[PDB]
C-alpha cells in the first residue's frame, strides 16, 4: 500500500535504490527507425528515442517518423502520446500528429528556454494576429485566447487542415515552473494543474490521446502521466490500495524509455497520488484547497 510503503522508503532513505531497481527491470525494445540516418535531424536527444513497437507513425509515404510514443494503458483505459519538445523542423510533423491522432489537448511541461538553452521550438502562436502556417504538412494554427496564471497558462488554439478546411479547437496547458530534472512546487500545484487538464475533457476517451511533452518527453512527462493513471486506476475501483505505483510505471515504460528521470520525481509521484486520493475517495472540497495553495492568481 503506497502510503505505508512511502513511509518505509522515506525512513530508510532508499528512494535512490528503489528508483534504480525500476530502471533495472525496465523494458528494452528496439528503436531502429529512430536511429535511421535520415531521421538524425528529427531527434532532439541522441539518447531518447521511441521504441519501434509504440511509435506514432505520421500518415505520409515520404517519412512517417516523429519522436513520439503511444503509452496505451490497457487496465486504466487511457492513452497518452508522449513526445519531445518539437524542433524547428518538426513543428509541422507535431501538428500533423495532433491532427491525425485526433488529440483535443496538448500538455507542455517545460519552457522554450531553460538553463540558457533552447529546449523546445516556439511551435504555437504567441499572438492572435500572427497565425502560423506549416507549409510542409499544410496546417494552419491560430491563437484564439489565453488564460495566464502564476505558474501555468491555458491557451485556446484553432488547428486547420488547409487541405480540407476542417477546423478543430486544441487546448494547450502550459506548466511554466517545472524545472527539468526537477519537481513541481508542491503536490497541490501539480494536482491543481492536472485537474484543470481533466476538467477540460482533453483526457476523455471520446477524443484521441492527449499529447504530453517536455523537452525530452520522458521525465516531467512520465511524472505527469504516472500520477494521472494511478489516480484513474483507484477511481475505477474506488480502492486506493489496489494501485501499485511502481508496477504502473514499469507498465508505462514498456511503451517509452526513461519515464520519470530522477528518484525525487518518483517520490513526488507518490506524494501527488496520495494527496489526489483524497478527492477520488469523496472529499471533493480538497480541489478548491489545492487551487488556494497553488496561488495561481
Ligand atoms: O545524459 P545524462 O544526464 O548524462 O544521463 C542521461 C542519459 C540518458 C537519458 C535518457 C534516458 C535515460 C534512461 C533511460 O532508460 P533506462 O536506462 O532507465 O531504462 C532511457 C533514456 C537521460 C539522462
Ligand atoms: Mg495583442
UniProtKB/Swiss-Prot annotation:
Positions where Phosphoserine occurs in the chain: 49, 241-242
Catalytic reaction(s) noted: O-phospho-L-tyrosyl-[protein] + H2O = L-tyrosyl-[protein] + phosphate
Membrane topology, record value: Peripheral membrane protein
Name of the top EC class for this enzyme: hydrolase
Protein modification: The active site can be restored by reduction. Ser-49 is the major site of phosphorylation as compared to Ser-241 and Ser-242. Activated by phosphorylation at Ser-49.
Occurrences of domain Tyrosine-protein phosphatase (ranges): 2-276
Keyword hit for Endoplasmic reticulum: yes
Keywords carried by this UniProt record: Acetylation, Endoplasmic reticulum, Hydrolase, Membrane, Oxidation, Phosphoprotein, Protein phosphatase, S-nitrosylation
Locations listed in the record: Endoplasmic reticulum membrane
EC number from the UniProt entry: 3.1.3.48
Signal peptide positions on this chain: none
Modified residues (Cysteine sulfinic acid (-SO2H)): 214
GO cellular component: cytoplasm; cytoplasmic side of endoplasmic reticulum membrane; cytosol; early endosome; endoplasmic reticulum; endosome lumen; glutamatergic synapse; mitochondrial crista
Residue numbers carrying Cysteine sulfenic acid (-SOH): 214
Phosphotyrosine carried by residues: 19, 65
Coiled-coil residue windows: none
Entry-annotated residues carrying S-nitrosocysteine: 214
Disulfide partners: none
Crosslink feature (N,N-(cysteine-1,S-diyl)serine (Cys-Ser)) location: 214-215
Cysteine persulfide: residues carrying this PTM: 214
MF (Gene Ontology): cadherin binding; enzyme binding; ephrin receptor binding; insulin receptor binding; non-membrane spanning protein tyrosine phosphatase activity; protein kinase binding; protein phosphatase 2A binding; protein tyrosine phosphatase activity
Any GO BP: growth hormone receptor signaling pathway via JAK-STAT
Active site: 214 (phosphocysteine intermediate)
Function summary: Tyrosine-protein phosphatase which acts as a regulator of endoplasmic reticulum unfolded protein response. Mediates dephosphorylation of EIF2AK3/PERK; inactivating the protein kinase activity of EIF2AK3/PERK. May play an important role in CKII- and p60c-src-induced signal transduction cascades. May regulate the EFNA5-EPHA3 signaling pathway which modulates cell reorganization and cell-cell repulsion. May also regulate the hepatocyte growth factor receptor signaling pathway through dephosphorylation of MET.
Protein family (similarity comment): Belongs to the protein-tyrosine phosphatase family. Non-receptor class 1 subfamily.
Protein name: Tyrosine-protein phosphatase non-receptor type 1
Residue range from the parent sequence: 2 to 298 of 435
